[PDB]
Amino acid sequence: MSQSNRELVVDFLSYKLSQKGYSWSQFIPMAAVKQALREAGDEFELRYRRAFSDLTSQLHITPGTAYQSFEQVVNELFRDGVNWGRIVAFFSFGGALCVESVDKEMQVLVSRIASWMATYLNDHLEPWIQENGGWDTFVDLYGN
Numbered sequence: 001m002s003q004s005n006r007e008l009v010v011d012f013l014s015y016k017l018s019q020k021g022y023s024w025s026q027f028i029p030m031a032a033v034k035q036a037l038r039e040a041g042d043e044f045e046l047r048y049r050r051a052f053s054d055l056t057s058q059l060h061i062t063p064g065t066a067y068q069s070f071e072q073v074v075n076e077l078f079r080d081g082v083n084w085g086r087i088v089a090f091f092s093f094g095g096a097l098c099v100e101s102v103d104k105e106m107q108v109l110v111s112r113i114a115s116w117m118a119t120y121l122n123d124h125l126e127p128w129i130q131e132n133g134g135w136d137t138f139v140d141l142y143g144n
């Protein structure tokens, strides 16, 4: 549901901020989902470190331009459809935007980015997720 999805976003973003030595104080099957997502994001960031790195020096964020940048990238990422990989890449993108934000003393973006990710998950990705077995399938596929 929509609250679940909000939980996932906050867990993932806190995880990424913790890893990089920042504060996240701008904030059981569910535990299994969260664990699989953390690991998949790390794995994604490892295999696609080139793409990851290219994007993290590409855009310059301000509180005034953040939302249009977030939306362009997300629309590009899902232009041709949804799959699980693309969903993991979506979470990683969010994580990278938050980390960049805290770096540049734009802490206010962190919770805005969380809510933009939850909204997009709940409006645009959730239908595809329920159709494809829900988050249980994602956990089975990642660990099988």
Ligand SMILES: CC1(C)CCC(c2ccc(Cl)cc2)=C(CN2CCN(c3ccc(C(=O)NS(=O)(=O)c4ccc(N[C@H](CCN5CCOCC5)CSc5ccccc5)c(S(=O)(=O)C(F)(F)F)c4)cc3)CC2)C1
Pocket: 040, 043, 044, 047, 048, 051, 052, 055, 073, 076, 077, 083, 084, 085, 086, 088, 089, 090, 092, 093, 096, 138, 139, 141, 142, 143
């Ligand atoms: C246009 C633009 C610039 C826009 C913006 C932008 C962009 C740039 C930076 C950032 Cl930051 C964000 C976005 C791009 C850049 N990029 C390029 C990379 N892109 C993809 C590459 C491959 C797939 C794919 O393959 N999709 S997939 O077939 O569904 C699939 C396959 C395998 C696994 N999993 C394995 C797990 C193996 N482990 C072994 C160890 O032990 C445990 C299991 C591999 S890790 C793994 C592998 C792949 C994905 C995730 C994790 C999973 S998965 O983890 O989701 C699962 F399994 F389903 F859970 C799902 C999907 C997309 C998409 C976009 C382009």
